[PDB]
Protein backbone atom coordinates (compact mmCIF):
# COMPACT_ATOMS: atom_id res chain seq x y z
CA UNK A 1 0.00 0.00 0.00
CA UNK A 2 3.00 2.23 0.50
CA UNK A 3 4.27 4.04 -2.59
CA UNK A 4 7.68 2.95 -3.93
CA UNK A 5 10.77 4.63 -2.59
CA UNK A 6 11.61 6.01 -6.03
CA UNK A 7 8.73 8.43 -5.53
CA UNK A 8 10.03 9.58 -2.14
CA UNK A 9 13.71 9.29 -2.96
CA UNK A 10 15.26 12.73 -3.50
CA UNK A 11 15.69 15.45 -0.88
CA UNK A 12 13.01 17.53 -2.54
CA UNK A 13 11.44 19.42 0.38
CA UNK A 14 12.29 21.43 3.45
CA UNK A 15 12.85 19.10 6.42
CA UNK A 16 9.40 18.59 7.87
CA UNK A 17 9.71 16.87 11.24
CA UNK A 18 7.16 15.29 13.53
CA UNK A 19 6.16 18.33 15.55
CA UNK A 20 3.26 20.37 16.93
CA UNK A 21 2.20 21.39 13.43
CA UNK A 22 2.57 18.04 11.67
CA UNK A 23 0.83 15.69 14.07
CA UNK A 24 -0.89 12.46 13.24
CA UNK A 25 2.26 10.90 11.80
CA UNK A 26 2.22 7.08 11.66
CA UNK A 27 5.11 5.83 13.72
CA UNK A 28 8.50 5.01 12.22
CA UNK A 29 8.98 1.29 11.97
CA UNK A 30 12.69 1.16 12.77
CA UNK A 31 12.67 1.63 16.53
CA UNK A 32 15.51 -0.62 17.60
CA UNK A 33 18.66 1.12 16.39
CA UNK A 34 21.51 -0.53 18.32
CA UNK A 35 21.94 -4.30 18.34
CA UNK A 36 24.33 -7.04 19.30
CA UNK A 37 26.43 -6.94 22.44
CA UNK A 38 25.66 -3.29 23.04
CA UNK A 39 26.69 -3.65 26.72
CA UNK A 40 30.35 -4.27 25.90
CA UNK A 41 33.34 -2.07 26.71
CA UNK A 42 35.46 -0.13 24.23
CA UNK A 43 38.45 -2.33 24.94
CA UNK A 44 37.07 -5.60 23.60
CA UNK A 45 35.89 -4.41 20.17
CA UNK A 46 38.59 -2.44 18.33
CA UNK A 47 37.33 -2.60 14.75
CA UNK A 48 34.65 -0.39 13.21
CA UNK A 49 33.20 -0.63 9.72
CA UNK A 50 31.02 2.21 8.46
CA UNK A 51 28.54 1.94 5.65
CA UNK A 52 29.07 5.43 4.37
CA UNK A 53 26.75 6.87 1.75
CA UNK A 54 27.72 8.43 -1.57
CA UNK A 55 24.52 10.27 -2.55
CA UNK A 56 22.36 13.10 -1.24
CA UNK A 57 19.09 11.22 -1.13
CA UNK A 58 16.36 10.01 1.18
CA UNK A 59 16.37 6.60 2.86
CA UNK A 60 13.11 5.22 4.13
CA UNK A 61 12.57 3.92 7.64
CA UNK A 62 11.44 0.68 5.98
CA UNK A 63 14.80 0.39 4.27
CA UNK A 64 16.67 1.25 7.46
CA UNK A 65 14.97 -1.57 9.34
CA UNK A 66 15.40 -3.98 6.41
CA UNK A 67 19.13 -3.24 6.35
CA UNK A 68 19.30 -3.59 10.14
CA UNK A 69 17.78 -7.06 10.01
CA UNK A 70 19.92 -8.02 6.99
CA UNK A 71 23.07 -7.00 8.87
CA UNK A 72 22.06 -8.57 12.19
CA UNK A 73 21.11 -11.90 10.61
CA UNK A 74 24.50 -12.30 8.96
CA UNK A 75 26.34 -11.09 12.06
CA UNK A 76 24.64 -13.57 14.39
CA UNK A 77 25.24 -16.26 11.78
CA UNK A 78 28.92 -15.43 11.35
CA UNK A 79 30.47 -13.69 14.37
CA UNK A 80 28.40 -15.52 16.96
CA UNK A 81 25.48 -14.06 18.82
CA UNK A 82 27.22 -11.39 20.91
CA UNK A 83 30.56 -10.83 19.24
CA UNK A 84 29.56 -7.59 17.53
CA UNK A 85 27.59 -4.36 17.94
CA UNK A 86 25.73 -2.79 15.06
CA UNK A 87 24.22 0.64 15.35
CA UNK A 88 22.15 2.47 12.76
CA UNK A 89 23.37 6.08 12.79
CA UNK A 90 20.31 7.54 11.08
CA UNK A 91 16.97 8.22 12.69
CA UNK A 92 14.07 9.09 10.35
CA UNK A 93 12.70 12.50 11.31
CA UNK A 94 11.51 13.92 7.99
CA UNK A 95 7.94 12.84 7.33
CA UNK A 96 6.51 12.53 3.84
CA UNK A 97 3.07 13.27 2.53
CA UNK A 98 0.50 11.43 0.43
CA UNK A 99 -2.04 13.11 -1.83
CA UNK A 100 -4.82 10.52 -2.02
CA UNK A 101 -7.03 10.48 -5.13
CA UNK A 102 -10.21 8.61 -4.11
CA UNK A 103 -13.76 13.76 -7.83
CA UNK A 104 -11.93 16.93 -6.77
CA UNK A 105 -8.56 16.89 -8.50
CA UNK A 106 -5.55 18.97 -7.46
CA UNK A 107 -7.77 21.39 -5.51
CA UNK A 108 -6.27 21.84 -2.06
CA UNK A 109 -3.54 19.27 -2.49
CA UNK A 110 -1.55 18.84 0.70
CA UNK A 111 -0.98 15.34 1.88
CA UNK A 112 -1.65 13.52 5.08
CA UNK A 113 1.57 12.03 6.49
CA UNK A 114 2.45 8.60 5.08
CA UNK A 115 5.79 7.67 6.55
CA UNK A 116 9.17 8.79 7.78
CA UNK A 117 12.39 9.32 5.88
CA UNK A 118 16.04 10.00 6.68
CA UNK A 119 17.97 12.56 4.64
CA UNK A 120 21.59 11.59 4.00
CA UNK A 121 24.57 13.60 2.80
CA UNK A 122 27.48 12.54 0.62
CA UNK A 123 29.72 11.00 3.24
CA UNK A 124 27.34 10.66 6.19
CA UNK A 125 27.57 7.28 7.90
CA UNK A 126 24.39 5.20 7.62
CA UNK A 127 25.30 2.10 9.59
CA UNK A 128 28.30 1.08 11.64
CA UNK A 129 29.43 -2.24 13.11
CA UNK A 130 31.88 -2.49 16.01
CA UNK A 131 33.66 -5.82 16.27
CA UNK A 132 36.95 -7.55 16.97
CA UNK A 133 39.96 -6.92 14.78
CA UNK A 134 39.90 -10.43 13.29
CA UNK A 135 36.23 -10.17 12.25
CA UNK A 136 37.06 -7.83 9.39
CA UNK A 137 35.79 -9.75 6.37
CA UNK A 138 32.58 -10.66 8.17
CA UNK A 139 31.72 -7.01 8.78
CA UNK A 140 32.61 -6.05 5.20
CA UNK A 141 30.37 -8.88 3.99
CA UNK A 142 27.57 -7.85 6.37
CA UNK A 143 27.65 -4.25 5.17
CA UNK A 144 27.89 -5.41 1.56
CA UNK A 145 24.77 -7.49 2.08
CA UNK A 146 22.96 -4.61 3.75
CA UNK A 147 23.79 -2.22 0.88
CA UNK A 148 21.24 -3.93 -1.33
CA UNK A 149 18.43 -2.79 0.96
CA UNK A 150 19.10 0.88 0.09
CA UNK A 151 18.83 2.89 -3.11
CA UNK A 152 21.75 4.55 -4.77
CA UNK A 153 25.45 4.10 -4.06
CA UNK A 154 26.80 3.28 -0.63
CA UNK A 155 30.44 2.59 0.09
CA UNK A 156 32.12 0.61 2.84
CA UNK A 157 34.94 2.08 4.91
CA UNK A 158 36.78 0.55 7.86
CA UNK A 159 37.79 3.45 10.02
CA UNK A 160 40.92 4.12 12.03
CA UNK A 161 38.92 5.14 15.11
CA UNK A 162 38.62 2.83 18.12
CA UNK A 163 35.13 1.53 17.60
CA UNK A 164 32.39 4.00 18.45
CA UNK A 165 34.78 6.72 19.62
CA UNK A 166 36.29 9.81 18.06
CA UNK A 167 39.84 8.81 19.01
CA UNK A 168 42.29 7.00 16.77
CA UNK A 169 42.88 3.30 17.19
CA UNK A 170 46.67 3.54 17.20
CA UNK A 171 46.97 6.03 20.05
CA UNK A 172 43.89 4.91 22.03
CA UNK A 173 46.05 2.46 23.98
CA UNK A 174 48.67 5.08 24.82
CA UNK A 175 46.02 7.57 25.92
CA UNK A 176 44.19 5.06 28.12
CA UNK A 177 47.50 4.02 29.68
CA UNK A 178 48.29 7.70 30.26
CA UNK A 179 44.83 8.03 31.92
CA UNK A 180 43.70 10.88 29.72
CA UNK A 181 40.75 8.63 28.78
CA UNK A 182 38.49 6.54 31.01
CA UNK A 183 36.33 3.59 29.90
CA UNK A 184 32.66 4.13 30.76
CA UNK A 185 30.85 1.51 28.71
CA UNK A 186 30.59 1.41 24.92
CA UNK A 187 32.10 4.91 24.81
CA UNK A 188 35.13 6.53 26.38
CA UNK A 189 35.45 9.64 28.54
CA UNK A 190 37.93 12.38 27.73
CA UNK A 191 39.74 14.15 30.57
CA UNK A 192 41.38 17.53 29.89
CA UNK A 193 44.09 19.29 31.86
CA UNK A 194 41.46 21.83 32.88
CA UNK A 195 39.47 20.47 35.81
CA UNK A 196 39.82 21.25 39.47
CA UNK A 197 42.68 19.01 40.46
CA UNK A 198 40.67 17.13 43.07
CA UNK A 199 39.51 15.23 39.99
CA UNK A 200 43.18 14.83 39.04
CA UNK A 201 44.15 13.39 42.41
CA UNK A 202 41.01 11.25 42.35
CA UNK A 203 42.11 9.69 39.06
CA UNK A 204 45.72 9.30 40.13
CA UNK A 205 44.64 8.34 43.66
Amino acid sequence: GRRPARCYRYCKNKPYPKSRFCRGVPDAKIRIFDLGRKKAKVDEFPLCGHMVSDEYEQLSSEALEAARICANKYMVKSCGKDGFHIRVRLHPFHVIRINKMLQTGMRGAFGKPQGTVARVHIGQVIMSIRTKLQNKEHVVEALRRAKFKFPGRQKIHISKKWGFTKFNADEFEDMVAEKRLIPDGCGVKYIPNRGPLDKWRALHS
Binding site: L197, W200, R201, H204, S205
Partner: protein
Protein backbone atom coordinates in the same frame (compact mmCIF):
# COMPACT_ATOMS: atom_id res chain seq x y z
CA UNK B 1 17.95 13.52 44.22
CA UNK B 2 17.30 17.05 43.07
CA UNK B 3 18.12 18.32 39.63
CA UNK B 4 21.05 20.72 39.75
CA UNK B 5 19.61 24.14 38.99
CA UNK B 6 22.78 26.22 38.62
CA UNK B 7 24.48 24.29 35.82
CA UNK B 8 26.42 25.27 32.68
CA UNK B 9 23.13 25.98 30.93
CA UNK B 10 22.06 28.26 33.80
CA UNK B 11 25.23 30.31 33.66
CA UNK B 12 25.30 30.48 29.86
CA UNK B 13 21.70 31.69 29.67
CA UNK B 14 22.10 33.97 32.71
CA UNK B 15 22.09 37.74 32.13
CA UNK B 16 23.48 39.96 34.85
CA UNK B 17 21.85 43.12 36.11
CA UNK B 18 23.52 46.46 35.92
CA UNK B 19 26.35 46.82 38.41
CA UNK B 20 24.53 49.31 40.60
CA UNK B 21 21.42 47.12 40.49
CA UNK B 22 23.43 44.08 41.59
CA UNK B 23 25.05 46.11 44.36
CA UNK B 24 21.58 47.30 45.35
CA UNK B 25 22.32 50.99 45.34
CA UNK B 26 20.29 52.54 42.51
CA UNK B 27 16.80 52.35 41.05
CA UNK B 28 17.17 52.69 37.29
CA UNK B 29 13.42 53.20 36.80
CA UNK B 30 13.32 56.30 38.98
CA UNK B 31 16.80 57.36 37.84
CA UNK B 32 15.70 57.34 34.20
CA UNK B 33 12.52 59.23 35.01
CA UNK B 34 14.52 61.72 37.07
CA UNK B 35 17.70 62.62 35.21
CA UNK B 36 16.91 62.53 31.49
CA UNK B 37 16.70 66.03 30.08
CA UNK B 38 14.15 66.71 27.35
CA UNK B 39 15.71 66.46 23.91
CA UNK B 40 14.47 69.88 22.85
CA UNK B 41 16.49 71.37 25.70
CA UNK B 42 19.75 70.46 23.90
CA UNK B 43 22.43 69.84 26.54
CA UNK B 44 20.92 72.05 29.21
CA UNK B 45 21.89 70.50 32.56
CA UNK B 46 19.24 69.12 34.89
CA UNK B 47 20.20 69.42 38.53
CA UNK B 48 19.41 67.02 41.35
CA UNK B 49 19.77 67.21 45.10
CA UNK B 50 20.71 63.69 46.19
CA UNK B 51 19.95 62.81 49.81
CA UNK B 52 21.50 59.66 51.29
CA UNK B 53 21.12 59.07 55.02
CA UNK B 54 23.85 56.70 56.17
CA UNK B 55 24.19 55.26 59.67
CA UNK B 56 26.46 58.05 60.88
CA UNK B 57 26.26 60.97 58.44
CA UNK B 58 24.05 62.39 55.70
CA UNK B 59 25.33 62.91 52.16
CA UNK B 60 23.63 65.76 50.33
CA UNK B 61 24.91 66.40 46.82
CA UNK B 62 23.80 68.37 43.76
CA UNK B 63 24.63 66.71 40.47
CA UNK B 64 23.64 66.70 36.82
CA UNK B 65 23.89 63.80 34.41
CA UNK B 66 26.45 63.62 31.62
CA UNK B 67 27.42 60.57 29.59
CA UNK B 68 30.43 59.69 31.74
CA UNK B 69 28.51 60.16 34.98
CA UNK B 70 26.81 62.51 37.37
CA UNK B 71 29.24 65.38 37.80
CA UNK B 72 28.54 66.66 41.32
CA UNK B 73 28.34 70.44 41.48
CA UNK B 74 28.37 70.90 45.24
CA UNK B 75 28.57 68.48 48.16
CA UNK B 76 27.84 68.88 51.85
CA UNK B 77 28.03 66.18 54.49
CA UNK B 78 26.89 65.85 58.07
CA UNK B 79 30.24 65.05 59.69
CA UNK B 80 31.41 68.58 58.84
CA UNK B 81 28.79 70.09 61.15
CA UNK B 82 31.27 70.27 64.10
CA UNK B 83 32.94 73.03 62.08
CA UNK B 84 29.78 75.02 62.83
CA UNK B 85 28.92 73.63 66.25
CA UNK B 86 26.74 70.53 66.15
CA UNK B 87 29.00 68.21 68.09
CA UNK B 88 27.19 64.86 67.93
CA UNK B 89 23.82 63.59 66.82
CA UNK B 90 24.85 64.09 63.21
CA UNK B 91 22.29 61.77 61.61
CA UNK B 92 19.00 63.12 62.96
CA UNK B 93 16.38 65.30 61.30
CA UNK B 94 17.97 68.49 62.61
CA UNK B 95 21.35 67.64 61.14
CA UNK B 96 19.56 66.75 57.91
CA UNK B 97 18.17 70.28 57.87
CA UNK B 98 21.59 71.72 58.68
CA UNK B 99 23.35 69.88 55.87
CA UNK B 100 20.59 70.77 53.42
CA UNK B 101 21.06 74.40 54.45
CA UNK B 102 24.82 74.06 54.06
CA UNK B 103 24.44 72.52 50.61
CA UNK B 104 22.17 75.35 49.51
CA UNK B 105 24.25 78.20 50.90
CA UNK B 106 27.51 76.67 49.63
CA UNK B 107 26.15 76.23 46.11
CA UNK B 108 24.73 79.77 46.07
CA UNK B 109 28.12 81.08 47.17
CA UNK B 110 29.81 78.92 44.53
CA UNK B 111 27.71 80.41 41.73
CA UNK B 112 27.64 83.97 43.05
CA UNK B 113 24.09 84.38 44.36
CA UNK B 114 24.51 84.48 48.12
CA UNK B 115 23.35 88.08 48.58
CA UNK B 116 20.32 87.55 46.36
CA UNK B 117 17.93 84.71 47.36
CA UNK B 118 18.42 84.63 51.10
CA UNK B 119 15.36 82.49 51.81
CA UNK B 120 14.21 81.83 55.36
CA UNK B 121 16.82 83.36 57.64
CA UNK B 122 14.53 82.61 60.57
CA UNK B 123 13.16 79.08 60.67
CA UNK B 124 9.37 78.80 60.61
CA UNK B 125 8.60 75.32 59.29
CA UNK B 126 5.71 76.22 57.00
CA UNK B 127 5.52 76.14 53.20
CA UNK B 128 8.28 78.13 51.55
CA UNK B 129 9.29 78.38 47.90
CA UNK B 130 12.04 80.59 46.52
CA UNK B 131 10.26 82.51 43.77
CA UNK B 132 12.74 84.17 41.44
CA UNK B 133 12.97 87.93 41.13
CA UNK B 134 13.16 89.75 37.82
CA UNK B 135 16.37 91.30 36.53
CA UNK B 136 18.55 89.50 39.02
CA UNK B 137 19.76 86.07 37.84
CA UNK B 138 17.14 83.42 38.27
CA UNK B 139 16.59 80.96 41.07
CA UNK B 140 18.38 77.64 41.17
CA UNK B 141 15.95 74.86 40.26
CA UNK B 142 16.84 71.27 41.14
CA UNK B 143 14.88 68.13 41.88
CA UNK B 144 15.04 65.91 44.95
CA UNK B 145 16.51 62.40 44.69
CA UNK B 146 15.51 60.14 47.55
CA UNK B 147 17.02 57.01 46.06
CA UNK B 148 15.51 54.05 47.90
CA UNK B 149 13.98 55.69 50.95
CA UNK B 150 10.30 54.89 51.40
CA UNK B 151 9.21 58.52 51.27
CA UNK B 152 6.74 58.63 54.14
CA UNK B 153 5.91 61.44 56.51
CA UNK B 154 8.67 62.82 58.70
CA UNK B 155 11.66 61.69 56.67
CA UNK B 156 15.16 63.14 56.94
CA UNK B 157 15.26 63.17 53.16
CA UNK B 158 12.55 65.81 53.39
CA UNK B 159 14.47 67.43 56.22
CA UNK B 160 17.39 68.03 53.88
CA UNK B 161 14.81 69.15 51.32
CA UNK B 162 13.53 71.83 53.69
CA UNK B 163 17.13 72.76 54.48
CA UNK B 164 17.85 73.49 50.83
CA UNK B 165 14.49 75.26 50.43
CA UNK B 166 15.23 77.59 53.33
CA UNK B 167 18.75 78.02 51.98
CA UNK B 168 17.38 79.42 48.76
CA UNK B 169 17.02 76.58 46.28
CA UNK B 170 13.76 76.40 44.34
CA UNK B 171 12.92 72.71 44.65
CA UNK B 172 9.39 71.55 43.79
CA UNK B 173 7.84 70.02 46.88
CA UNK B 174 4.62 69.64 48.79
CA UNK B 175 4.06 70.04 52.50
CA UNK B 176 2.65 66.54 52.81
CA UNK B 177 5.70 64.58 53.90
CA UNK B 178 7.19 67.02 56.40
CA UNK B 179 6.68 65.94 60.03
CA UNK B 180 3.45 67.53 61.15
CA UNK B 181 1.15 66.61 58.30
CA UNK B 182 -1.23 64.29 60.10
CA UNK B 183 -2.93 61.62 58.02
CA UNK B 184 -6.24 62.03 59.84
CA UNK B 185 -7.18 65.70 59.69
CA UNK B 186 -5.16 66.24 56.47
CA UNK B 187 -3.75 69.63 57.48
CA UNK B 188 -0.22 70.76 58.35
CA UNK B 189 0.66 72.46 61.65
CA UNK B 190 3.99 74.16 61.04
CA UNK B 191 5.04 74.52 64.68
CA UNK B 192 5.38 70.74 64.99
CA UNK B 193 7.63 70.78 61.91
CA UNK B 194 9.60 73.59 63.53
CA UNK B 195 10.03 71.48 66.66
CA UNK B 196 11.30 68.59 64.54
CA UNK B 197 13.68 70.90 62.65
CA UNK B 198 15.01 72.27 65.93
CA UNK B 199 15.30 68.78 67.39
CA UNK B 200 12.70 69.23 70.11
CA UNK B 201 11.67 65.58 69.90
CA UNK B 202 15.23 64.51 70.72
CA UNK B 203 15.44 66.99 73.59
CA UNK B 204 12.09 65.82 74.91
CA UNK B 205 13.17 62.18 74.70
CA UNK B 206 16.32 63.18 76.56
CA UNK B 207 14.17 64.74 79.30
CA UNK B 208 11.86 61.71 79.23
CA UNK B 209 14.72 59.28 79.79
CA UNK B 210 16.32 61.32 82.55
CA UNK B 211 12.93 61.36 84.28
CA UNK B 212 12.06 57.69 83.67
CA UNK B 213 15.37 55.90 84.20
CA UNK B 214 18.92 57.18 84.10
CA UNK B 215 20.50 53.81 83.25
CA UNK B 216 18.53 53.74 80.00
CA UNK B 217 19.42 57.41 79.58
CA UNK B 218 23.17 56.82 79.83
CA UNK B 219 22.91 53.79 77.55
CA UNK B 220 20.85 55.61 74.90
CA UNK B 221 22.60 58.98 75.00
CA UNK B 222 26.24 59.02 75.82
CA UNK B 223 28.10 61.29 73.41
CA UNK B 224 25.57 64.00 74.19
CA UNK B 225 26.73 63.71 77.81
CA UNK B 226 30.38 63.58 76.74
CA UNK B 227 29.94 66.74 74.64
CA UNK B 228 27.73 68.13 77.50
CA UNK B 229 24.65 68.58 75.30
CA UNK B 230 21.65 69.33 77.51
CA UNK B 231 17.98 69.60 76.41
CA UNK B 232 17.71 73.33 77.10
CA UNK B 233 20.78 74.06 74.95
CA UNK B 234 19.42 72.22 71.90
CA UNK B 235 17.35 74.84 70.07
CA UNK B 236 19.88 77.63 70.63
CA UNK B 237 22.68 75.36 69.43
CA UNK B 238 20.84 74.59 66.20
CA UNK B 239 20.02 78.28 65.68
CA UNK B 240 23.67 79.24 66.16
CA UNK B 241 24.56 76.48 63.70
CA UNK B 242 22.11 77.98 61.19
CA UNK B 243 23.65 81.43 61.63
CA UNK B 244 27.20 80.06 61.34
CA UNK B 245 26.34 78.19 58.15
CA UNK B 246 24.64 81.21 56.60
CA UNK B 247 27.63 83.42 57.40
CA UNK B 248 30.48 81.07 56.34
CA UNK B 249 29.31 78.47 53.81
CA UNK B 250 32.42 77.70 51.74
CA UNK B 251 34.29 74.42 52.09
CA UNK B 252 38.06 74.38 52.29
CA UNK B 253 39.60 71.02 51.53
CA UNK B 254 42.10 69.22 53.67
CA UNK B 255 45.65 69.46 52.31
CA UNK B 256 46.85 66.51 50.27
CA UNK B 257 49.48 64.52 52.13
CA UNK B 258 52.68 63.03 50.79
CA UNK B 259 51.98 59.30 50.74
CA UNK B 260 54.03 56.43 52.10
CA UNK B 261 52.85 54.10 49.28
CA UNK B 262 52.42 50.92 51.29
CA UNK B 263 50.06 48.28 49.91
CA UNK B 264 47.45 47.03 52.34
CA UNK B 265 45.97 44.19 50.28
CA UNK B 266 47.37 41.22 48.44
CA UNK B 267 48.37 41.74 44.79
CA UNK B 268 47.15 39.50 42.03
CA UNK B 269 49.05 36.23 41.62
CA UNK B 270 50.71 35.73 38.24
CA UNK B 271 50.46 33.00 35.62
CA UNK B 272 53.90 31.53 36.33
CA UNK B 273 53.16 31.35 40.06
CA UNK B 274 49.82 29.63 39.68
CA UNK B 275 51.11 27.07 37.18
CA UNK B 276 53.92 26.40 39.63
CA UNK B 277 51.32 26.00 42.40
CA UNK B 278 49.51 23.29 40.47
CA UNK B 279 52.82 21.64 39.54
CA UNK B 280 53.86 21.53 43.20
CA UNK B 281 50.42 20.26 44.23
CA UNK B 282 50.68 17.37 41.77
CA UNK B 283 54.29 16.57 42.74
CA UNK B 284 53.47 16.75 46.44
CA UNK B 285 50.45 14.48 46.00
CA UNK B 286 52.55 11.92 44.13
CA UNK B 287 55.32 11.93 46.70
CA UNK B 288 52.79 11.60 49.53
CA UNK B 289 51.38 8.60 47.67
CA UNK B 290 54.81 7.01 47.37
CA UNK B 291 55.58 7.67 51.05
CA UNK B 292 52.20 6.14 51.85
CA UNK B 293 53.11 3.16 49.64
Amino acid sequence: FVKVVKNKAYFKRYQVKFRRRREGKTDYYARKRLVIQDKNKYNTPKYRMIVRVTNRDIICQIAYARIEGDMIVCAAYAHELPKYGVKVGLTNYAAAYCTGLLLARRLLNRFGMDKIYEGQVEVTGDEYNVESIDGQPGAFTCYLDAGLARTTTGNKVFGALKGAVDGGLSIPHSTKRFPGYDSESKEFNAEVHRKHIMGQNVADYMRYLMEEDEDAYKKQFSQYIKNNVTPDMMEEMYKKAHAAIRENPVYEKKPKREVKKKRWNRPKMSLAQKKDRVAQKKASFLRAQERAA
